[PDB]
């Protein structure tokens, strides 16, 4: 899976460890091995949410499978809780787009996974 | 809805107010209130279009519903018009990918819209 | 078509000429003009793969058609080979998500392709 976070919080506010904690927390939550988790954090972005420029985040989680109604609620609880606790971004200024990717549409290692 | 613009136009060429103009022009054309609209603008990118590095932009609009061929041509004329009057990017060097998100695949506020 | 690469390799490590190369190699592999190809490379990113900060990349290829089993396998050989020879990223630390876009969902020149 891959998790991307874009945020107007500044770089010096993302705590050491934050990527490694999202890696291990996502491997538990998705049940995928940690070796296939990628995390990407992009601070200091020019963003607005609900018309204001208070701290906010736009995120994406792509996974082959493990995407659905209850699971994505669970991911939002986990990921909005870490973005509030670690980055101090209120949950109601976070969006997370979830994508259930087909294996034939994810390249890795020179081939795809179908 | 969430609108993202990535462009090779430099930061200082992106005028103040441009994220509020896209917020209020999206809430009028999508019909969704500004509370739900997030906008993210990323200047100074390394990007080419048709092979050349004149001004260009790659953008995405994600929304739960309100996405279709004729709606998307309305959004394309309004957003290409703001990118050409504000950022002076030619409309034929702009791509906008539109995504109709299922509510269960959008997280917000620690849960999801399903 | 549009190809985006996000990677933690530094900007000075990207060959000057790498976007032109990717334009021309994605016009020979998708079979599409280089006028409608857009390429975007984002170095120096905060990202991890398998929980370590060794060189990695998260990419996307979007195209109207030309996207499917065989073609995605071919693009994964071509583009994993390019990022390993040019940016020295190991193919097992690259993800490429492939998106077959409906023509009605791609805006360009103030309209959509359908």
In angstroms, the CA C88 to CA C69 distance is 26
In a 3-state reduction of DSSP, which class is residue C83?
A: helix
Cβ contact A41:A14 at 8 Å = yes
Say yes or no: A16 contacts chain C, CB-CB below 8 A: no
Active site residue C1: yes
Q: What is the CATH number of the domain that holds C6?
A: 3.30.429.10
For residue C17, the distance in angstroms to the closest alpha carbon of chain A comes to: 23
Contacting chains of A (3 CB pairs or more, <8 Å) are B, C
User: Which domain, by its residues, includes A1?
Assistant: 1-114
**Cβ neighbour number for residue A54 with a 10 Å cutoff:** 13
Q: Taking CA C105 as the corner, what is the angle to CA A56 and CA C30, rounded to the nearest 5 degrees? A: 110
**Per-position b or e across A69-99, b if 16+ CB within 10 A of its CB:** eebbbbbbbbbbeebbebbebebebbbbbbb
Give the residue among C3, C85, C77, C90 at the shortest CA–CA distance from C42: C3
In angstroms, the CA A24 to CA A51 distance is 34
For residue B21, the distance in angstroms to the closest alpha carbon of chain C comes to: 17
CA distances B18 to B47, B90, B99, C103, Å, are 21, 17, 22, 28
CA distances A13 to A10, A81, B21, B112, C56, Å, are 5, 16, 29, 27, 24
In B26-83, where do the E strands start and end? 38-42, 46-49, 57-63
Say yes or no: B19 contacts chain A, CB-CB below 8 A: yes
Gaps in chain C (C to N distance exceeding 2.5 A) after:
none
CA distances C95 to A59, B46, B111, C59, C91, Å, are 17, 20, 27, 6, 8
Helix (H) or strand (E) holding C57: strand C57-63
Phi, psi (rounded to 5 degrees) for C79: -85, -30
Query: Experimental method for this entry?
Result: X-ray
Burial of B27 (0-12, 13-18, 19+ CB in 10 A): middle
**Cβ neighbour number for residue B6 with a 10 Å cutoff:** 19
Give the residue among A93, A96, A91 at the shortest CA–CA distance from A63: A96
On the CB side of B106, CA atoms within 13 Å amount to: 21
C47·A38 Cβ contact <8 A: yes
- The chain C residue lying nearest A20, using CA atoms, is C51
For residue A34, the distance in angstroms to the closest alpha carbon of chain B comes to: 22
In A8-113, where do the E strands start and end? 38-42, 46-49, 57-63, 94-100, 106-108, 111-112
Distance of CA C18 to the CA centre of its chain: 11
Cβ contact A29:A74 at 8 Å = yes
Q: Which residues of B are annotated as a binding site for substrate?
A: 32, 64, 97
Cβ contact B57:B93 at 8 Å = yes
Q: Indicate the number of domains in chain A.
A: 1
Strand partners, A46: B41
Phi, psi (rounded to 5 degrees) for C5: -125, 125
CA distances A78 to A29, A55, A81, C46, C52, Å, are 8, 18, 5, 21, 22
Distance of CA B9 to the CA centre of its chain: 15
Q: Taking CA B62 as the corner, what is the angle to CA B58 and CA A103, rounded to the nearest 5 degrees? A: 85
In angstroms, the CA B62 to CA A101 distance is 17
Cβ contact C91:A109 at 8 Å = yes
Task: Collect all residues of chain A within an 8 Å Cβ-Cβ radius of residue B44.
Answer: none
In angstroms, the CA B112 to CA A78 distance is 12
Number of H helices, E strands in chain A: 2, 7
Give the residue among A56, A85, A59 at the shortest CA–CA distance from A72: A59
Cβ contact B42:B6 at 8 Å = yes
Structure tokens at B85: 């009057």
| Ranges of H-type helices in chain C | 18-30, 69-87
Helix (H) or strand (E) holding A85: helix A69-87
Cβ contact C85:C31 at 8 Å = no
Say yes or no: C67 contacts chain B, CB-CB below 8 A: no
Cβ contact B77:A83 at 8 Å = no
In angstroms, the CA C28 to CA C103 distance is 21
Say yes or no: B76 contacts chain A, CB-CB below 8 A: no
B47·C35 Cβ contact <8 A: no
Strand order in the sheet with B94-100: A46-49, B38-42, B2-7, B57-63, B94-100, C106-108, C111-112
């Amino acid at each position: 899976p891959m998790f991307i976070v874009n945020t107007n919080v500044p770089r010096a506010s993302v705590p050491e460890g934050f990527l490694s904690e999202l890696t291990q927390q996502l491997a538990q939550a998705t049940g995928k091995p940690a070796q296939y988790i990628a995390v990407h954090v992009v601070p200091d972005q020019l963003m607005t949410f609900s018309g204001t420029n208070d701290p906010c985040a736009l995120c994406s989680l792509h996974s082959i499978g493990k995407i659905g109604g209850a699971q994505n609620r669970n991911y939002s609880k986990l990921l909005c809780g870490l973005l509030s606790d670690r980055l101090h971004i209120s949950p109601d200024r976070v969006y997370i787009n979830y994508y259930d990717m087909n294996a034939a549409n994810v390249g890795w290692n020179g081939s795809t996974f179908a």
